């Protein structure tokens, strides 16, 4: 049998029946836990997604947890998972600190629970918001237009997999997209989309990157795990399109030849709409966005003014375990590694 490469993610159409359950199961958590980081809630996570999810929901997310064959692309595309209702919504605050977490509050819950069929449990980072809660708004800040951040717009912003630079990086992402009226695409690229190993990929297993943290370095292998089906920590923009990089000769010279394979797999075909979510094994798929002008989109060569982009992000790990020698104390949840194995020291 010949391999099937993937080049784009699996789309899943979500029905009105499910999204009546997803909206239902919502309200009932609410009533029950008060908020999604409710560590009562957190605690039976697990027992939450297989019990109140749709169960298609349930089947599709379990087989993609322990999904690292040839033929898995690493993302899934949950068309229409959310009715969001626009108007109750509002206009979209300045930036992410803004964000009304009581009306979100609800699809806090929602994407926990898809976190929770993987297994796996929501987390968050020190480096993150210095934390910022489990579920995080990203929304384009005028003041970080030009910036390589998810409160950027006007930059494209270069495929990348979630925290290249931390060792106990995210396992699994969420992207809930609440307003998308820019008509952005969402940009996916799969390690798998390269299919055999070949030449250019097997020199990415040596140790020998830098991998630059944002706010001498220790370098890191830019493929891991099994040496025939990899998994990847990559970020174009600031491991190679980065002066302050710092890579030697051989590595950057390496980087730049896998850019030019894993560039012309770039998948940017999906455009997001309002209530879809993207789910993503962040070992296997990195995510980008194209550039855009942040509250406008061009239709017949006019410009359409529209409210601002509005996404919910939620991080997961699959094990406490593996990563407990850098979670607080009383927060085996909360990520406190701040570089490749060193931790944040606080005063
Ligand atoms: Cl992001
Ligand atoms: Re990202």
């Known amino acids: 049998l010949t391999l099937e490469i993937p080049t784009s993610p699996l789309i899943i159409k979500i029905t009105q029946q499910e999204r009546n359950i997803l ?47 040839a033929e898995q692309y690493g993302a899934i595309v949950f068309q229409g998972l959310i009715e969001v209702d626009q108007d109750d919504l509002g206009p979209t605050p300045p930036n992410w600190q803004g964000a009304d977490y009581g009306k979100l ?96 990929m097997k020199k990415l297993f040596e140790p020998i990157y830098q991998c630059p943290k944002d706010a001498s370095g220790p370098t890191a292998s830019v493929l891991y795990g099994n040496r025939e089906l990899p998994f990847i920590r990559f970020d174009a923009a600031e491991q190679i399109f980065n002066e302050n990089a710092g890579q030697t000769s051989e590595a950057l010279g390496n980087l730049m030849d896998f850019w030019d394979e894993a560039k012309t797999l770039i998948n940017s075909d999906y455009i997001p709409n309002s209530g879809d979510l993207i ?9 980008g966005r194209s550039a855009f002008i942040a509250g406008q989109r061009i239709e017949n060569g006019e410009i359409i003014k529209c409210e601002r982009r509005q996404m919910l992000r939620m991080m997961s790990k699959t094990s406490l375990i593996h990563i407990r020698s850098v979670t607080r104390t009383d927060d085996p949840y909360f990520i406190m590694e701040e570089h490749l194995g060193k931790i944040f020291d606080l005063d």
């Open 23 to 69: 909206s239902n199961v919502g309200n009932l958590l609410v009533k029950a836990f008060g908020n999604y980081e409710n560590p009562d809630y957190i605690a039976s996570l697990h027992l939450h997604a297989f019990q109140l999810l749709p169960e298609r929901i349930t089947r599709i997310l379990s087989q993609f947890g322990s999904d690292f064959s």
């Open 279 to 287: 789910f993503v094994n962040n070992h296997l798929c990195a995510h």
């Open 105 to 200: 509050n609800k699809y806090g819950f929602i994407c926990s629970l898809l976190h929770g069929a993987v297994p796996s449990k929501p987390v968050q980072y020190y480096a993150q918001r210095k934390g910022g809660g489990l579920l995080h708004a990203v929304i384009p800040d005028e003041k970080m237009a030009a910036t390589q951040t998810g409160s950027g717009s006007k930059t494209d912003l270069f495929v990348h997999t979630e925290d290249a630079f931390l060792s106990n990086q995210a396992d699994f992402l969420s992207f809930l997209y609440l307003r998308n009226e820019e008509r952005v695409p969402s940009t996916l690229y799969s390690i798998r989309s390269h299919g055999k190993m070949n030449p250019v």
